[PDB]
Amino acid sequence: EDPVTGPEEVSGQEQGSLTVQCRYTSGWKDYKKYWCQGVPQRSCKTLVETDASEQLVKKNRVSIRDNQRDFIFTVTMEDLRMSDAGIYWCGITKGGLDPMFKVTVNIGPVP
Ligand SMILES: C[N+](C)(C)CCOP(=O)(O)O
Numbered sequence: 333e334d335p336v337t338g339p340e341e342v343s344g345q346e347q348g349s350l351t352v353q354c355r356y357t358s359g360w361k362d363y364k365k366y367w368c369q370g371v372p373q374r375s376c377k378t379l380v381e382t383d384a385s386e387q388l389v390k391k392n393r394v395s396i397r398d399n400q401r402d403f404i405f406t407v408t409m410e411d412l413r414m415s416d417a418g419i420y421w422c423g424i425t426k427g428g429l430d431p432m433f434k435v436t437v438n439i440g441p442v443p
């Protein structure tokens with residue numbers, strides 16, 4: 333089974349926000365969750381990472397919060413710019429190889 337599942341594709345508009353939900357299998361409750369940007373995959377930049385609780389982490393234009401009742405972590409990116417498009421990953425931090433799931437972001441420009 334896949335430890336982490338999100339949307340393969342998500343869309344946002346410049347100046348708006350977008351929200352990505354990554355579900356994870358229940359056993360990964362007590363592991364830190366993260367949202368990572370760019371390529372190559374194992375060298376992506378971690379934008380935000382939880383502390384393995386339900387507490388919100390917000391850094392720069394990005395927030396993440398883990399719902400450990402329903403096993404879904406929610407990422408929001410606000411005040412979107414065209415440079416926010418591209419490849420991202422929902423991830424779980426563990427010793428050794430992290431579970432990761434690729435999300436591709438499309439951004440449309442202001443008229
Ligand atoms: C994916 N990462 C950039 C957050 C860390 C490196 O990946 P991994 O070796 O822990 O799987």
Ligand SMILES: [Ca+2]
Pocket residue numbers: 425426427428429430
């Ligand atoms: Ca790791």
